[PDB]
Design an enzyme around this catalytic site. Structure first.
Site, PDB file in Angstrom:
ATOM      1  N   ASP A  35       0.851  -1.180   0.000  1.00  0.00           N
ATOM      2  CA  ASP A  35       0.000   0.000   0.000  1.00  0.00           C
ATOM      3  C   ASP A  35       0.895   1.242   0.000  1.00  0.00           C
ATOM      4  O   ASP A  35       2.070   1.180   0.389  1.00  0.00           O
ATOM      5  CB  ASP A  35      -0.855   0.018   1.267  1.00  0.00           C
ATOM      6  CG  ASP A  35      -1.982   1.052   1.236  1.00  0.00           C
ATOM      7  OD1 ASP A  35      -2.813   0.965   0.322  1.00  0.00           O
ATOM      8  OD2 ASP A  35      -2.026   1.954   2.117  1.00  0.00           O
ATOM      9  N   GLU A  50       1.456  -0.190  -4.730  1.00  0.00           N
ATOM     10  CA  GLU A  50       0.445   0.773  -5.088  1.00  0.00           C
ATOM     11  C   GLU A  50       1.116   2.134  -5.189  1.00  0.00           C
ATOM     12  O   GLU A  50       1.460   2.747  -4.183  1.00  0.00           O
ATOM     13  CB  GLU A  50      -0.702   0.840  -4.071  1.00  0.00           C
ATOM     14  CG  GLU A  50      -1.837   1.766  -4.491  1.00  0.00           C
ATOM     15  CD  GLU A  50      -2.559   2.510  -3.336  1.00  0.00           C
ATOM     16  OE1 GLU A  50      -1.991   2.700  -2.230  1.00  0.00           O
ATOM     17  OE2 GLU A  50      -3.696   2.912  -3.543  1.00  0.00           O
TER      18      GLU A  50
END
Ligand SMILES: *[C@@H]1O[C@H](CO)[C@@H](O)[C@H](O)[C@H]1NC(C)=O
Ligand SMILES: [Ca+2]
EC number: 3.2.1.1
Length: 476
Positions: free
Chosen positions: A206, A230
């Site tokens: 993330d 990400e």
């Protein structure tokens, strides 16, 4: 598993809280507007692996597993896993450590991979930044481990992006100071231990753009597995360089033009064609990116259009583009929720039908890709090549000569007229017999080397040599 191992994979991305409950109920309430835990568990996933593997997926990506803030905040519960407070405890809502290990075991028994979502950038806290009690965080129980409280105001200021705290000031995401050796050491030790503890095969990372780049090579190394990051930005000049510090990134550059191309009958094939070519030439390795058009941070594809042909074409593109396909649970049931929380619908409320339109499309597209890969060790490293486009069409070619998949996609939609596209540049010899695997029909390359592709109902066409398909159960 290594990056090379992951190139052949196809990922079903799911929210643990929203995919499957232990009791297997298909009616249990899950009102997305409530933003509360709905009861999905790791054991639930195990019970529905036949449903996932029947679509031809080879791997799952599950949301983060660490213990979360306990509150129902003004923005709901931490059902999504991105608001951790104790990294050495699991989120009890999903089950026990034995359950998570049982999920990795079950996946391995099926030859599938487990990918786990992880957050290194921040913890989570119910309240404004000035109200954070750092002692609730484990092991980072002191303000000393965190960047001074500020918010990210300008995403062109990369120092702000990295050093300041995410979010508005409703649910605070205290920003760990990842430039400190004590933080790097703790995170590196943690991630290696996580992977080993639970036999994790790869990680989805993330909030990668919010941690300085010198953190990620050591983190990826400590993990010992393929990591896909990400990096939430459509500009490949910004996002693709992150492949110099991580194995892969999510293909946000392709996301935006891909959605636009297929979200309506007037979408731009030119912009998608151009971005395919830019990523292919300028990104360090397009074959290690993850292709998607649907996730938990954007409106679902069907929120833009319920046209089933457009959804089939975008799903086909995701599976047959360079890199690792990533389908978001619900996409295969034509879920239509808009932005968070509306795009966190519970998969079980569909009843998990295995004969829905997009279940079948995805099963066929993964089937041919899995088969082609098993026959062509060059498929995954042959860079997808867009060979044709017009106002409503894009055609692409991927795979070794004699074994290439040639895909013709369309945005004419379900009412599209019937006509024949004379496709040049597919690279098949004159008289090569091809199977169109979505509809299980045949086309023969003409004497001039052009493929006469029947087009109708705006449907995607995926072609592969009939000889190479031979005695497979595809189109039997
Ligand atoms: C790995 O397993 C050990 C048990 O020997 C445990 O103490 C450690 O916290 C685990 N690490 C993670 C990240 O789960
Ligand atoms: Ca940060």
């Amino acid at each position: 598993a290594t990056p090379a191992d992951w190139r052949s994979q196809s990922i079903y991305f799911l929210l643990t809280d929203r995919f499957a409950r232990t009791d297997g109920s298909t009616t249990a309430t899950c009102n997305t507007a409530d933003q509360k835990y709905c009861g999905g568990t790791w054991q639930g996933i195990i019970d529905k692996l036949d449903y996932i593997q029947g679509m031809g997926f080879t791997a799952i990506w599950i949301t983060p597993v660490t213990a979360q803030l306990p509150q129902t905040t003004a923005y709901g519960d931490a059902y999504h896993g991105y608001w951790q407070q104790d990294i050495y405890s699991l989120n009890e809502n999903y089950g026990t450590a034995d359950d998570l290990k049982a999920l990795s075991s079950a996946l391995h028994e099926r030859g599938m991979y487990l990918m786990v979502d992880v957050v290194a950038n921040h913890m989570g806290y119910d309240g404004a930044g000035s109200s954070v009690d750092y002692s609730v965080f484990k092991p980072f129980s002191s303000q000393d481990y965190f960047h001074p409280f500020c918010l990210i105001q300008n995403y062109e200021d990369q120092t702000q992006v990295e050093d300041c705290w995410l979010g508005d000031n409703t649910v605070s995401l205290p920003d760990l100071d990842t430039t400190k050796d004590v933080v790097k050491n703790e995170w590196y030790d943690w991630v290696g231990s996580l992977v080993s503890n639970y036999s994790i095969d790869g990680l989805r990372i993330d909030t990668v753009k919010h941690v300085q780049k010198d953190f990620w090579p050591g983190y990826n190394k400590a993990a010992g597995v393929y990591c896909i990051g990400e990096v939430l930005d459509g500009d490949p000049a910004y996002t693709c360089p992150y492949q110099n510090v991580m194995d892969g990134v999510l293909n946000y550059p392709i996301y935006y033009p891909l959605l636009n191309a297929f979200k309506s009958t007037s979408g731009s094939m030119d912009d998608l064609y151009n971005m395919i070519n830019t990523v292919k030439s300028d990104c360090p390795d397009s074959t290690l990116l993850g292709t998607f058009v649907e996730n938990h941070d954007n409106p679902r594809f069907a929120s833009y259009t319920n046209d089933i042909a457009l959804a089939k074409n975008v799903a086909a593109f995701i599976i047959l583009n360079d890199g690792i396909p990533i389908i978001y649970a619900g996409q295969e049931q034509h879920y239509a929720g808009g932005n968070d929380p509306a795009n966190r619908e519970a998969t079980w409320l569909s009843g998990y039908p295995t004969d829905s339109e997009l279940y079948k499309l995805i099963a066929s597209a993964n089937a041919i890709r899995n088969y082609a890969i098993s026959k062509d060790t060059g498929f995954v490293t042959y860079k997808n090549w867009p060979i044709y486009k017009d106002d409503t069409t894009i055609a692409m070619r991927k795979g070794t000569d004699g074994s290439q998949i040639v895909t013709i996609l369309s945005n004419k939609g379900a009412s599209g007229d019937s006509y024949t596209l004379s496709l040049s540049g597919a690279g098949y010899t004159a008289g090569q017999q091809l199977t169109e695997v979505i509809g299980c029909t045949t086309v023969t390359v003409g004497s001039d080397g052009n493929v006469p592709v029947p087009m109708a109902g705006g449907l995607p066409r995926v072609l592969y040599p009939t000889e190479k398909l031979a005695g497979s159960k595809i189109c039997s």
